[PDB]
Amino acid sequence: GLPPAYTQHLREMAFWDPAITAQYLNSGPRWGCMQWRDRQIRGKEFVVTRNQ
Amino acid sequence: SVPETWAKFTDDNVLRSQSERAASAKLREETENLLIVTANEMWNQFNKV
Amino acid sequence: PLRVAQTRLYQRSHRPNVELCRDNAQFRLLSEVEELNMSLRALKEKLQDA
Amino acid sequence: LKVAQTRLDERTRRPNVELCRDMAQLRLVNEVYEVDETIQTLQQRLRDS
Amino acid sequence: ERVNDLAFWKSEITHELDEMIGETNALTDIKRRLERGLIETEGPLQVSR
Amino acid sequence: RSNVELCRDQTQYGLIDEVHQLEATINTMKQKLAQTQNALDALFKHLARIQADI
Amino acid sequence: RKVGERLEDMHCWKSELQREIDELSSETDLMMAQKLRLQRALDATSVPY
Amino acid sequence: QIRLNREHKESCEMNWSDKVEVYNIDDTCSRYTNESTQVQFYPHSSKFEESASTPETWAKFNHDNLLRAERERLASVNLRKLIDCILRDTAEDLRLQCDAVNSAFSSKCMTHRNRYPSVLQLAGY
Amino acid sequence: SIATDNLQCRERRQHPDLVRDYVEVELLKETELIRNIQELLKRTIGQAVD
Amino acid sequence: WDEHDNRTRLAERIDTVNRWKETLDKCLTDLDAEIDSLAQAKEKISQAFQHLCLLQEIRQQLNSDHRDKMETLEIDRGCLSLNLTSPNISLKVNPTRIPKDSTTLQQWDEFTRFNKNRAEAEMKASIELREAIALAIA
């Protein structure tokens, strides 16, 4: 049932990726720098979720 | 340890215990053989005398 | 009665997690098993001298 | 977050032979990271409300 | 399922323990028979001398 | 479930049929275990006589 | 002798646990009935607003 | 309070369930004698038992369950006797203020206020 | 990966040489140093993204 | 085999109650938008307020039915989530009790159908009221 990185952590030798969340499962980018912050200014339209 | 290593450790213990039981069983059968051969030998020499 | 005492001890050992108890029946059965073993040993000694 | 992470620490008092890492360790650390992420996104959206 | 596997291994251990106790008291019985037979073999030596 | 929702579906008939089968199943398994231990007692009862007469 | 006294000692505790679960059910059922009385009061105060 | 009652009912019943397990096995335990069948050599058993408690703590555990369960039940009794009283207060106060408004009118209002919930509808009967 | 492979390979030795020598001490120091360094690198990447 | 068959029966009944829940939610949203439209045209007036008083009661009764379907869906999902070696597995007392409600399937369907037919009749009568009020003003 477990995917393959969690299988190779149950092996003897350490061929695994050191960072625990996998690439193919995590929706967010790892250590990505972009984050859209909209400054609240009276007037124009505010919005959310510019990443997706 | 990994669970396969843990399970193989406990089966190695169980196989060692089974091996030692086998050695004791063979030893006790040979004790009975030594007893019957020894008794027959002494009585045969007794009757020759 | 060795068979009876051992089977009673086994069925009492297959008990759930809180009802498994240091019981009066447990002390009586332990004394019974010890007494039966000593009596069997004395009976075997009498057989050998016979 | 309470129940999962104290489940982790109340597990990890184990002795030497069974001090291991099964799937429960990996599923529990994934649990606590994703619950933490849910806390941050709900806090941010409460602030915007 | 982890604690169920632990229970299965415990049952295997106690099976081998029961067989092991049966072996060791059988072998003590055979040993005391051997000692009694040894003294009984010792006496006709005195007779022959 | 509350007052309008106790519906008495197919699931309640299925569950009572499973329980009603299950006491008979466990009873038959205990009966066969008792039969097997009786058989083991009889085999010991003749093994003793063979071992003595040898 | 001892098994009978342990049997009836446990039979007592089984009996008043048997009574207490029925008591809690018959309490909480009337608690639900009062909550059902409480809901339509909120409805019949929503109208006059 | 409904959910808390439900939880404590499950706790007390699970205690009763393990006691039913022990009562089920002691009844088969007592019916063994020296003549009848179903006996085998179980050699480690007298040597290697392990126990968890004493019969005093076996009693004390279910005293604590019944104590907490009855405290919870009486707290539910307290709240169910508060709810009906405050609902009577709400019904009386609304009917009083409506009558005061009608007296003010006397000193579209007829055609609207001619429909109104009564005391039994404010109570929910 | 290289260090853990050295650990299992040197642990697969035979009976009159299964010795806790200085090599195993240095291999354990290697495993500890590698994991500390890469976790420090993880936190530094987080701060540089922030 | 009997365990997996009962898995199948519970999953089927969760789907067939989710159908009624989502259609109740659709009718709820439609009725709220309709009350807003009728109140805007209010802003014959006596007949209109009588119609508002008649639409409101069906709105709360359908709200009650919708919440009941929410709770049924949640606890039946819990029933499907229960399997072997779950923690809260218990040897119950008297599991074959007829519940105190004793409600059959046909009644359980026709009550919600009664609610829906009353709601749709109220909607069409209010549509007639809307066109009559516009005609009167002009």
Short mmCIF file of all heavy atoms in Angstrom, two decimals, chain E residues 10-47, unseen atoms left out:
data_model
loop_
_atom_site.label_atom_id
_atom_site.label_comp_id
_atom_site.label_asym_id
_atom_site.label_seq_id
_atom_site.Cartn_x
_atom_site.Cartn_y
_atom_site.Cartn_z
N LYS E 10 4.56 -14.37 19.97
CA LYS E 10 4.50 -14.88 21.35
C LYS E 10 3.97 -16.31 21.40
O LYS E 10 4.48 -17.14 22.17
N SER E 11 2.93 -16.60 20.60
CA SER E 11 2.37 -17.95 20.58
C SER E 11 3.36 -18.98 20.05
O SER E 11 3.44 -20.11 20.57
N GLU E 12 4.14 -18.60 19.03
CA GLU E 12 5.21 -19.49 18.55
C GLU E 12 6.25 -19.78 19.63
O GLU E 12 6.68 -20.94 19.82
N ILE E 13 6.63 -18.73 20.38
CA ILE E 13 7.61 -18.89 21.46
C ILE E 13 7.10 -19.86 22.53
O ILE E 13 7.82 -20.77 22.94
N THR E 14 5.84 -19.70 22.95
CA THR E 14 5.36 -20.53 24.07
C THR E 14 5.16 -21.99 23.65
O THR E 14 5.34 -22.90 24.48
N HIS E 15 4.84 -22.24 22.37
CA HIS E 15 4.83 -23.61 21.85
C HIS E 15 6.21 -24.27 22.00
O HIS E 15 6.33 -25.39 22.55
N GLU E 16 7.25 -23.58 21.53
CA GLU E 16 8.59 -24.17 21.63
C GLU E 16 9.05 -24.32 23.07
O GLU E 16 9.74 -25.30 23.40
N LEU E 17 8.62 -23.42 23.96
CA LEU E 17 8.97 -23.53 25.38
C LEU E 17 8.38 -24.78 26.03
O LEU E 17 9.06 -25.46 26.81
N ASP E 18 7.11 -25.09 25.72
CA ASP E 18 6.49 -26.29 26.29
C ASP E 18 7.21 -27.56 25.84
O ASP E 18 7.52 -28.44 26.67
N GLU E 19 7.54 -27.63 24.54
CA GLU E 19 8.28 -28.80 24.05
C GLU E 19 9.67 -28.90 24.68
O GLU E 19 10.16 -30.00 24.96
N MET E 20 10.27 -27.74 24.98
CA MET E 20 11.63 -27.71 25.50
C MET E 20 11.67 -28.24 26.93
O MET E 20 12.59 -28.99 27.31
N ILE E 21 10.67 -27.87 27.74
CA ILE E 21 10.56 -28.36 29.12
C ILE E 21 10.34 -29.87 29.14
O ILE E 21 10.92 -30.59 29.98
N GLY E 22 9.49 -30.38 28.23
CA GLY E 22 9.32 -31.83 28.12
C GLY E 22 10.62 -32.57 27.81
O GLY E 22 10.92 -33.61 28.42
N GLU E 23 11.42 -32.01 26.90
CA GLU E 23 12.72 -32.61 26.58
C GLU E 23 13.65 -32.64 27.80
O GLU E 23 14.29 -33.67 28.07
N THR E 24 13.73 -31.53 28.54
CA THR E 24 14.74 -31.49 29.60
C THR E 24 14.37 -32.37 30.79
O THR E 24 15.27 -33.00 31.39
N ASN E 25 13.07 -32.54 31.11
CA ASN E 25 12.84 -33.46 32.22
C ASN E 25 12.93 -34.93 31.80
O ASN E 25 13.32 -35.77 32.64
N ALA E 26 12.66 -35.25 30.51
CA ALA E 26 12.95 -36.60 30.03
C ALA E 26 14.44 -36.94 30.14
O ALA E 26 14.81 -38.05 30.54
N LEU E 27 15.30 -35.98 29.80
CA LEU E 27 16.73 -36.28 29.83
C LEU E 27 17.26 -36.38 31.26
O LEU E 27 18.16 -37.20 31.52
N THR E 28 16.69 -35.62 32.21
CA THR E 28 17.08 -35.82 33.61
C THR E 28 16.67 -37.20 34.13
O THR E 28 17.41 -37.83 34.91
N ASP E 29 15.50 -37.70 33.69
CA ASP E 29 15.08 -39.06 34.05
C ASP E 29 16.05 -40.11 33.53
O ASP E 29 16.42 -41.05 34.26
N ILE E 30 16.47 -39.97 32.27
CA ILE E 30 17.41 -40.94 31.69
C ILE E 30 18.76 -40.89 32.41
O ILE E 30 19.40 -41.93 32.63
N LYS E 31 19.17 -39.69 32.83
CA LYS E 31 20.43 -39.56 33.57
C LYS E 31 20.39 -40.27 34.92
O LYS E 31 21.37 -40.93 35.32
N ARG E 32 19.27 -40.17 35.66
CA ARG E 32 19.24 -40.86 36.95
C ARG E 32 19.16 -42.38 36.77
O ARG E 32 19.72 -43.13 37.59
N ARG E 33 18.52 -42.84 35.69
CA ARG E 33 18.56 -44.26 35.36
C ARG E 33 19.98 -44.73 35.09
O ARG E 33 20.37 -45.83 35.50
N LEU E 34 20.77 -43.90 34.41
CA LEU E 34 22.16 -44.25 34.12
C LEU E 34 23.00 -44.34 35.39
O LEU E 34 23.86 -45.22 35.50
N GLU E 35 22.78 -43.44 36.35
CA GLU E 35 23.53 -43.51 37.61
C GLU E 35 23.22 -44.78 38.40
O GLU E 35 24.14 -45.44 38.93
N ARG E 36 21.92 -45.13 38.50
CA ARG E 36 21.53 -46.35 39.22
C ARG E 36 22.12 -47.58 38.54
O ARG E 36 22.66 -48.48 39.21
N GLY E 37 22.08 -47.61 37.20
CA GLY E 37 22.70 -48.71 36.47
C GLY E 37 24.21 -48.76 36.68
O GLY E 37 24.77 -49.86 36.72
N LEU E 38 24.86 -47.61 36.87
CA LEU E 38 26.31 -47.60 37.07
C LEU E 38 26.69 -48.27 38.39
O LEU E 38 27.63 -49.07 38.43
N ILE E 39 25.95 -47.98 39.46
CA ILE E 39 26.26 -48.64 40.74
C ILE E 39 25.98 -50.15 40.69
O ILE E 39 26.76 -50.97 41.22
N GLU E 40 24.88 -50.52 40.01
CA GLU E 40 24.56 -51.93 39.84
C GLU E 40 25.63 -52.65 39.03
O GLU E 40 25.94 -53.81 39.31
N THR E 41 26.23 -51.98 38.04
CA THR E 41 27.35 -52.58 37.33
C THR E 41 28.60 -52.64 38.19
O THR E 41 29.47 -53.49 37.95
N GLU E 42 28.72 -51.75 39.17
CA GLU E 42 29.94 -51.70 39.99
C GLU E 42 30.04 -52.93 40.89
O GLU E 42 31.14 -53.41 41.16
N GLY E 43 28.91 -53.42 41.41
CA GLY E 43 29.03 -54.54 42.37
C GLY E 43 29.61 -55.90 41.89
O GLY E 43 30.37 -56.54 42.66
N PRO E 44 29.30 -56.43 40.68
CA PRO E 44 29.96 -57.68 40.26
C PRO E 44 31.47 -57.58 40.08
O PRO E 44 32.13 -58.63 40.05
N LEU E 45 32.03 -56.38 39.95
CA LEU E 45 33.48 -56.23 39.97
C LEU E 45 34.06 -56.68 41.30
O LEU E 45 35.07 -57.39 41.34
N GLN E 46 33.41 -56.28 42.40
CA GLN E 46 33.81 -56.73 43.72
C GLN E 46 33.63 -58.24 43.86
O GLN E 46 34.48 -58.92 44.46
N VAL E 47 32.56 -58.78 43.26
CA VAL E 47 32.34 -60.23 43.30
C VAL E 47 33.47 -60.98 42.58
O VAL E 47 34.02 -61.96 43.11
#
